[model samples]
Target: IKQGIREVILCKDQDGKIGLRLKSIDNGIFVQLVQANSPASLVGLRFGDQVLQINGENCAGWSSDKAHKVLKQAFGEKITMTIRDRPFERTITMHKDSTGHVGFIFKNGKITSIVKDSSAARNGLLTEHNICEINGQNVIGLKDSQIADILSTSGTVVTITIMPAFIFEHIIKRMAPSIMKSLMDHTIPEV
Candidate 1:
């Protein structure tokens, strides 16, 4: 990102914490993550940079499997790589009020809370629902802000798919069957 490529060194730490993730977009692999104090973070690696090459091998058109294999191969040593910068995106169409407040609080793609008597609450959505899709768009590997944009952009009604996250023992044992039945009534059919 410093305009032109400047080589930097990185490696996993004592706890194997070289935090980075590779993502493939339209036949091109990219750096999707760079964790704090990690190798890439230590130097200048960043998210959204398209992988051009690794250790002198062509990275264009290569499946992510080979790219990750090569990255992990150089895990303990300082490996060289070349990349280009690009933007990122994904997922659904939920209509939101012009103000875009969905009446819910979220963190890391998971619903943390729903306002009492709010739109989401009326819909029977609950805490612990991990958002998986929006308007048929996949939310699999998106960041929180991006997911929020999708929710906020819905104009009035956002249709999202969620995976139920159950806390079995403490929650299940305490829930009334009626509550459970109500929750089931709103379940979206599986695709």
Candidate 2:
């Protein structure tokens, strides 16, 4: 496999479920979820992997709907996909100073501010980062108060995983207003 890219071969189960979920951002189609013990999961497919091609056909710039159609229409028992890993996810270890503060303000998992000369600032945490995990636990979608509690309760040292928020917002902005409106009313399919 080339650096950051891999090919995964998945066989659909008896129920015709390949057990992978996908999402389309403006940039590309990305794997969103892999069901436990399913073919996709067994093949090492991962969340946030960008699908570059499907069954020898380039899938770049394809919409989620189109990608679904291609997978559903595949003739054989196995579907081969080339995917690239999403980079830039990183973890930072921060030590709490006096007053049990890590020197960052976060709400809804997005770091809004960094305190200068504090652990967060010195550790290279940025406002563009959205916290994904704190102390080895996924905290996405948690309430602001609960997130705060988790940070406070994790003790003096915290390990946090963060992803870039700028690209996320960029995808949101890339969608036209009308498409965004339509998408808001529709949920991603569970195919």
Candidate 3:
């Protein structure tokens, strides 16, 4: 048998919450979650959350199988993370229990879609808008999971600054009729 084999698995934690772990796509490292319930949900861990380090141990050179071994060893133990949020800088933290599993899911910086009849859509924000900032927080490379966490807090209104994807600008300017038609079909009609 080979020294190590790559695979993905789901395991249950003491709290009976399901956790996910897999091999890294770029570096072949092992990435695992404590569990899917609890703080992880409040913090937003999506289908793909890359693991960069565990308790300050660099995992770049480790294979998927090796990473799993490390994670198994760390189960029920506190661990710090140094994770990449995709197209953004890495984040470092100290060891933390799964009380509030913050920061797991990863997403692109672009706004894929806006909710119909919501404040953003009603204010003319559309899909594919590059969100520059929300209430003064820079969101250039932030993922959807991160945005949701920030918005979950009690708040009445959110101010956002958005930029249109360059390519879509022509569609807005040249085909006014088409733009209106598309908006009517996909977006909530203006109140």
Candidate 4:
């Protein structure tokens, strides 16, 4: 990411969200989207980029809500961001003693949607949870069809594990001095 950095005037959507989206993962708020043709996209921010700092200060967990405040007050002004390079992978492991009717939906080898009151959701499956394994079988490098086939025939009393493709809880556990130092250092500004 030679051009990982960029500057854009915080633009607002009809919803007042900054012309960007952020997600909390592995204790960091990452650039979910830069917004097409908006100030962010026009500037060159790319998807999967990590929003590391704002105005040169550490803003580790600054979500879109915080961004809205900054943009609201600093209207007409440009905000400079230091974005880190992309791309991360994680392992998601799940276990089960017995398998039953786990009512859930899967697409692309990942759990894209979950039916409320269904076996999967009732037990604890989240749409954000990616499917990488089934019944102690590591399905990495396998296609969606293969994973679906495996899940289709899974046993009952199912215990499943799903970790986000995103970071936050799993990764920052041990490596950093503070998983999200700014989470404690900075307070959400008055809107």
Give the candidate number with the greatest TM-score: 2
Higher-lDDT candidate among 1 and 3? 1
Q: Write the per-residue lDDT of candidate 1 for residues 34-120, one digit (tens) a residue.
A: 554456655555545566777767787876677777777774756667766432322223334445666788776678898876667
Give stretches of model 2 more than 4 Å off: 1-3, 34-38, 41-44, 88-90, 95-101, 134-138, 145-159, 169-191
Error of 4 at 134 (Å): 27
TM-score quality measure for candidate 2: 0.65
Worst 10 residues of 1 by lDDT: 180-189
Candidate 4 lDDT by residue in tens digits, 21-137: 565555665654444345555555543457777666666666557854555665344566777754442333333324434666666445777665665554556676555335434
- lDDT, candidate 2, equals 0.70
| RMSD (CA, angstroms), candidate 4 | 14.4
- Lowest summed lDDT across 10 adjacent residues in model 2 is found at 180-189
Clashes of each: 13, 0, 3, 13
Q: Model 3, residue 3: displacement in angstroms?
A: 36
- TM-score list, all predictions: 0.43, 0.65, 0.34, 0.40
Off by more than 4 A, model 4: 1-18, 89-191
Where is model 1 more than 4 Å wrong at Cα? Answer: 1-3, 87-191
Per-model lDDT: 0.57, 0.70, 0.42, 0.50
